[PDB]
């Protein structure tokens, strides 16, 4: 339709923003513990999928918790300590989150450049309708 | 009459595009007020009903925020650009149609 380009770019921007927000939240909760109701904090990731309308935009179905084992730290003085006196610290890969943020920023800038070019082309298109 | 009927659809499309532009401007200007819900209108249904005030409905939130605001900047910007381009196209179509109707008188 020559106008689904805007939809594709907007979906890409929204997905990149979601992924960046997830990475930022993980970085903020890198060294947290004992969230609500006492359950240990676990990191989360996002999964990108394409919308087969062929070629289509990107979407994020749901946020998936990481299955990597939590860090078990010996500290009996914490009420969260089990019979072995261990507390469950969250699994956060700082380098992984930095790389994810870098990738999200680069994809966002590429998509905004594509939007700029297509907007210029579409503005120039209407000059022939007179 | 006939002259008004030949242009009613394009004129109403232009008017609805202007109203949707105003809605988008308002809900992009209120981007920081907590408790404010995003607003927009169903363009196709509105145009069909008017060709046969203005009905508006809330937008589905994208990500939660503690304050309560539910406006997404990139989505609003894309919608703004799309509506602006479609308004420009409608104006061009109306102008060409009027130019042809004027030209037929010579």
């Amino acid at each position: 339709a020559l106008l689904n380009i805007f939809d594709i770019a907007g979906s890409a921007l929204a997905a990149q923003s979601k992924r960046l927000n997830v990475a930022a939240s993980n970085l903020a909760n890198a060294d947290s513990v004992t969230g609500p109701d006492g359950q240990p904090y676990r990191a989360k990731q996002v999964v990108f999928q394409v919308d087969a309308a062929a070629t289509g935009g990107v979407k994020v179905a749901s946020v998936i918790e990481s299955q990597a084992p939590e860090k078990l730290v010996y500290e009996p003085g914490n009420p969260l300590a089990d019979a072995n006196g261990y507390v469950k610290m969250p699994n956060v890969d700082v380098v992984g989150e930095m790389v994810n943020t870098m990738s999200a920023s680069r994809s966002y800038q590429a998509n905004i450049e594509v939007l700029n070019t297509v907007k210029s082309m579409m503005l120039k298109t209407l000059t022939l309708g007179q | 009459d006939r002259l008004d009927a030949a242009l009613r659809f394009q004129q109403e499309a232009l008017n609805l595009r202007a109203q949707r532009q105003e809605i988008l401007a308002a809900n992009i200007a209120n981007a920081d007020t907590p408790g404010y819900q995003a607003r927009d209108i169903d363009f196709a249904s509105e145009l069909k009903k008017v060709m046969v005030a203005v009905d508006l409905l809330y937008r589905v939130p994208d990500q939660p925020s503690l304050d309560g605001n539910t406006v997404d900047m990139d989505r609003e910007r894309t919608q703004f650009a799309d509506n602006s381009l479609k308004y420009q196209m409608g104006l061009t179509v109306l102008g060409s149609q009027l130019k042809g109707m004027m030209n037929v008188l010579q």
Binding site: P36 | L57, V60, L66, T70
Partner: peptide, 21 residues
Amino acid sequence: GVPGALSNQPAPPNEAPIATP
């Protein structure tokens, strides 16, 4: 349903409980 679509009703208000009630 899908984010960014049109809905006739507002979403419930957001809250961030520090501790569960």
